[PDB]
Design a binder for this molecule. Sequence first.
Ligand SMILES: NCc1ccc(C(F)(F)F)cc1
Length: 330
Amino acid sequence: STGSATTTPIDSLDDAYITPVQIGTPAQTLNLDFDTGSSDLWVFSSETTASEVDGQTIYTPSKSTTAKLLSGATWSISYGDGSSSSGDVYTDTVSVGGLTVTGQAVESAKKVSSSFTEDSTIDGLLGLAFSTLNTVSPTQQKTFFDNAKASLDSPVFTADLGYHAPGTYNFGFIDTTAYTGSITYTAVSTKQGFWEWTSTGYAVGSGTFKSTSIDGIADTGTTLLYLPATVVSAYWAQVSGAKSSSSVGGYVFPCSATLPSFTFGVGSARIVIPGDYIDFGPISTGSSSCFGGIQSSAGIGINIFGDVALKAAFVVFNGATTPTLGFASK
Ligand SMILES: NCc1ccc(C(F)(F)F)cc1
């Protein structure tokens, strides 16, 4: 079997992408953020503290005939930006784009951080990293992808994120009309539970390609591209007037500047990120300083190939017994 679902930016800057997901019987449709950097499926629910909910659609397990409380199970998660949420666990039926899994763990948020509360467009997260990162205790739970794997035609899913436009998440097949050229596959390490891979180098604008190994993760749940300080400094040095700002918390640049592209290596292939993808607009309404889409990973401890990078490519998440990541131009 297969599934296919459209994913849509939540705002004009592509800060995140939401995909409709059907939970329960009869279906309750929630807009979830598909996150290849985490492994929990959690949703705002009828159990979320009422002051912590500001316009989100909530999952109501009492109205689902297929929902079963997973007795004793709890979950607690903290993201790399300091966001947090926690609660109890139901199992229910979950469908994405026609692909249905029965008995999927659905983690009902009793408490959510203020970050999620103030984002009315995101009803929850659907984690697509490896199940070793799932936070359910004492019985760790499997991701949606892991539960769907056996019934999928191929154990893959693909991310085709759009630039200021809708895109597609496909499960179980590779749409050969969605990319140009060939797909370049590269090895994945699962040792930290992420889709972790090694980029073969980079180039700034039309400069020479620097061959150098950049270890990092493929993370649809992270907006920006976080790379080592040396790479980020070489990028921003090509933008007139760019500087790292302590009060803003990263590199900013004059909104009047035009940005060079950024190229990253995948084995022998090259993925080019257009300079327009790196513009995240004014740091405040009316400001002439704009925020950069490429920032240093120094404070984070891991390099993150977020949406800025992934939306320049067609990306295959191959969950075969030896997992790989495939990249193609599009
Ligand atoms: N989008 C999920 C996510 C967020 C942060 C991290 C960090 F910071 F731990 F690398 C990993 C994964």
